[PDB]
Write a protein that binds this ligand. Structure first.
Ligand SMILES: CC(=O)N[C@@H]1[C@H](O[C@H]2[C@@H](O)[C@@H](CO)O[C@H](O)[C@@H]2NC(C)=O)O[C@H](C(=O)O)[C@@H](O[C@H]2O[C@H](CO)[C@H](O)[C@H](O)[C@H]2NC(C)=O)[C@@H]1NC(C)=O
Ligand SMILES: CC(=O)N[C@@H]1[C@H](NC(C)=O)[C@H](O)O[C@H](C(=O)O)[C@H]1OC(C)=O
Ligand SMILES: CC(=O)N[C@@H]1[C@H](NC(C)=O)[C@H](O)O[C@H](C(=O)O)[C@H]1OC(C)=O
Lengths: 671, 210
């Protein structure tokens, strides 16, 4: 029988190659499908499936009227089941994924079989058809299934189709169709009347993006999200990989075959050996009643019962605009004719930056670009970076604009995410910072507001699931005569790896010495009393330009200082974050980059950090204005020891095309 | 320099380098008399960008200062970040030479000895050979302190360590040197529980840092 339109929208049809093979599957996550492995095998119906890109260009069609078409990019097959998870080029909107069953199937249970395979009469139906199956037995990694009646059957081309169990008006995923006698099916000898079938069980595997207390993640298993995958390898090594196919984080527990990863009732996440007793790795957290969740934003975070982050792996790519697993950068370009547009430079596989593409090109008079500040970050929880603009208006009012990132690397039209009547906030006093301060899986905005009376307050604008911002609230504050705005150079990042971004300030201490404060983020998104993590009198504050990022892949961010020497030369000193004797601080500074005198002018180039080659370690790239007016991109990648490599040249242009002083890059912290 | 009163004179400089040349963070230094001229001098195992190892020697001037360095040994087969150089006369030549303790990714470690020699009038270190090796997991290079010297007084320098064991016990080991600069098996010496000697709370008097 045919399925009523709008039903089982989560059920997808797959087309492999140039109509070479037919296969079915089900939506499991916004950007993931679950399909049969046998249809992607070199030998159809049996044998191994290649990991990574499929052997043939493959697409899938799904939705209530099968009106949505998406491409499958990457396969990660399982070895003990006819099951492969396929990553999509883009997430599917408007279609709800099917959750995994949390209980075992049992004999006598009725399962609903739906797919796009051949029917009793139709070789290649244009709609979904279903069948009623009953469980006969459950063992190993498969189910023994038969028909509820002798009228229907599972037929060729329907492989990979979901077998659903109805519960509370909804459905749960129990198994995918695999092999059968296909009795009574079109194109099959009528002599065969059996509809007995065997399918892999999907109830005894990890799924979704969360681990509950007591949950166990078996080897050759994984959790998935839009911008990351968490998997435990057969060799016992628990790893997280990006959409680029590269590993961002690992426990390093390789060679311990049979090792298992589990989330304990104590709230910690650990890796245990084959003996079920010996611990090979632990997050060493405490959070009873908590859970471990792999976010769409990118990273893996362990949260307590109150929803507060306790620990994070830090497996994220900052301002990745297309979601391809590598950091990008973008700029707001003001043309001399009054019009403006946003240009995006995508990261390449070698860490270089490709030629920019433009988007959101608007006419003169649309924006009054005299008093605006630019922010970047993922403000929707998409898994791809967005942008935002904080702008003042001639009536003294303020608005905060947000533009969502597109899959093609461009941006959509900005929309107002927050606004205030004049007399509330003033653009001249606000100093916004982007990052995830709340730890809710969406970036938000913090403002260091300097009052005319000399007082200071930190305001936080948390993000909603609508992409909009809530009303600002204050937390940390200081009396007038204490903190001076003119002496504050601020950066942001997650400096202790607690899953929440926070502030740090390089303060000019009277004699132009440098003292670094950190302002840890509260569970409520606010900020706590600062403490000093680093200080030095060996360097002049007026010549320091601090930057933040994870420059050794620790999972916790740290800082470097670009220093402009009187000699005409410059260098970067990196201070890695570490905890010693229970005390958090930055370690001793070392020179990681240096140039000859006169080789670079710090006032003629714009800086932006990020993970450009997607190797899990943050690095920095610049657009520098050369003596002849030429603008050139350089990227210095980070070595495992936080030493930088030589700069790699990327896109460049004459001043006749790109004017240096007329463009501003979207950043995470000002200057 | 030292006086006959046991006191030191005012310091004076000799060799120097401009900024942007030698980076302190990439310098692992040892000292000894590497050409047998009767004066001790410096040598540096420098991390050459890609973490390869290049060894410089800084011969001592008659006035106690140091002269322009020259390269005595280089190899790209070993990772600088895993090398801990030591100096001494490990074959009784009368002129000091160096060995490198190497911490492998495999969990094992070894010592490679490069004996000092003069060939065609040119001073350099000879080809490296493995003189000591251990099973994987047998020793942790970050849990033990090293010190070289001639412990049995046979004229050939050798090395001994105080290693911190998994159970907190601290144990002394000495590996004596054979005439061919091969090491013998380690000989156990004094040992104690952590309740008596705390490993991380004691520092040995050395001739060169780390
Ligand atoms: C003249 C002056 O002091 N203007 C104030 C402020 O000056 C700074 C500041 O904008 C920073 C950061 O944006 O950039 C430069 O350092 C500016 N310096 C100079 C010399 O221009 O600029 C703001 C501003 O919004 O540019 C002024 O506020 C005014 O402009 C806004 C936006 O266009 C709007 O037009 C307001 O009506 C106008 N505000 C007032 C009160 O006249 C700052 N003004 C004051 C009075 O503090
Ligand atoms: C400015 C520029 O072109 N820099 C190049 C870059 N270094 C930095 C510091 O950015 C690399 O090394 C080049 C080289 O030294 O080959 C530099 O080029 C030149 C021409 O000196
Ligand atoms: C650490 C330790 O006790 N080392 C002993 C030492 N070797 C090294 C490399 O120091 C000798 O040979 C012993 C053996 O192998 O008899 C080692 O003991 C054990 C117990 O393996």
């Amino acid at each position: 029988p045919a399925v009523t339109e709008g039903g089982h929208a989560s059920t997808a049809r797959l087309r492999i190659g140039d109509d070479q093979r037919a296969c079915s599957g089900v939506l499991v996550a916004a950007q993931w499908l679950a399909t049969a492995a046998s249809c992607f095998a070199d030998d159809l119906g049996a044998g191994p499936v290649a990991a990574g890109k499929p052997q043939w260009r493959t697409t899938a069609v799904l939705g209530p009227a099968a009106g949505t078409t998406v491409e499958v990019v990457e396969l990660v097959p399982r070895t003990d089941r006819d099951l492969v998870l396929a990553r999509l080029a883009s997430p599917v909107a408007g279609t709800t994924p099917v959750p995994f069953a949390t209980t075992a199937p049992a004999p006598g249970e009725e399962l609903t079989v739906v797919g796009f395979g051949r029917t009793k009469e139709e070789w290649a139906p244009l709609t979904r058809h279903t069948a009623a199956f009953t469980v006969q037995s459950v063992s190993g990694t498969t189910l023994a299934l038969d028909g509820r009646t002798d009228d229907d059957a599972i037929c060729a081309g329907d492989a990979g189709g979901p077998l659903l169990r109805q519960k509370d008006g909804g459905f749960e995923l129990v198994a995918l169709a695999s092999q059968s006698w296909q009795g009574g099916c079109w194109g099959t000898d009528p002599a065969e009347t059996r509809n007995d079938a065997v399918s892999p069980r999907l109830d005894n595997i990890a799924g979704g993006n969360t681990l509950t207390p007591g949950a166990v993640l078996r080897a050759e298993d994984s959790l998935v999200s839009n911008a990351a995958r968490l998997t435990l390898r057969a060799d016992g090594d628990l790893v997280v990989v990006s959409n680029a196919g590269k590993t961002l984080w690992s426990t390093g527990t390789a060679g311990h075959l049979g090792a298992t990863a589990r989330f304990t009732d104590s709230g910690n996440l650990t890796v245990v050996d084959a003996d079920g007793t010996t611990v090979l790795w632990e997050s060493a957290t405490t959070a009873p009643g908590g859970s471990a969740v792999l976010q769409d934003r990118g990273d893996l975070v362990v949260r307590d019962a109150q929803g507060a982050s306790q620990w994070a792996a830090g497996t994220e790519v900052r301002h990745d605009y297309n979601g391809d697993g590598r950091s990008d950068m973008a700029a707001w370009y003001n043309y001399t004719d009054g019009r403006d547009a946003i240009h995006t430079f995508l990261g390449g596989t070698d860490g270089t930056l490709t030629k920019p593409l433009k988007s959101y090109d608007v006419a003169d008079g649309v924006w009054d670009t005299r008093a605006m500040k630019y922010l970047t970050g993922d403000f929707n929880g998409d898994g791809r970076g967005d942008t935002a603009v904080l702008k003042g208006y001639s009536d003294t009012s303020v608005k905060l604009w947000v533009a969502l990132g597109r899959a093609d690397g461009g941006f959509d039209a900005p929309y107002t995410a927050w606004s205030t009547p004049a007399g509330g906030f003033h653009i001249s006093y606000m100093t916004p910072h982007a990052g995830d301060f709340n730890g809710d899986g969406r970036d938000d905005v913090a403002v260091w507001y300097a009052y005319a009376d000399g007082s200071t307050k930190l305001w936080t604008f948390t993000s909603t699931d609508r992409g909009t911002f809530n009303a600002p609230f204050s937390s940390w504050s200081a009396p007038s005569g204490s903190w001076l705005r003119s002496r504050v150079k601020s950066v942001v990042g997650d400096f202790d790896g607690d899953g929440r971004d926070d502030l740090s300030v390089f303060y000019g201490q009277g004699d132009d010495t440098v003292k670094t404060y950190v302002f840890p983020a509260a569970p409520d998104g606010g900020f706590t009393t600062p403490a000093v993590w680093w200080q030095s009198a060996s360097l002049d504050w007026n010549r320091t330009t601090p930057h933040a990022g994870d420059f050794n892949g620790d999972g916790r961010d740290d800082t470097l200082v670009w220093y402009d020497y009187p000699d005409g030369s410059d260098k970067t000193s990196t201070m890695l974050s570490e905890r010693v004797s229970g005390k958090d601080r930055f370690g001793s500074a070392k020179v990681t980059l240096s140039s000859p005198p006169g080789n670079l002018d710090v006032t003629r180039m714009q800086f932006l950090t990020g993970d450009y080659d997607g190797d899990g370690r943050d690095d920095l790239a610049t657009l520098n204005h050369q003596a002849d007016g030429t603008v050139k991109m350089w990227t210095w990648t980070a070595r495992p020891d936080a030493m930088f490599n030589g700069g790699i040249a990327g896109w460049s242009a004459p001043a006749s095309s790109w004017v240096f002083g007329s463009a501003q890059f979207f950043t995470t912290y000002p200057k």
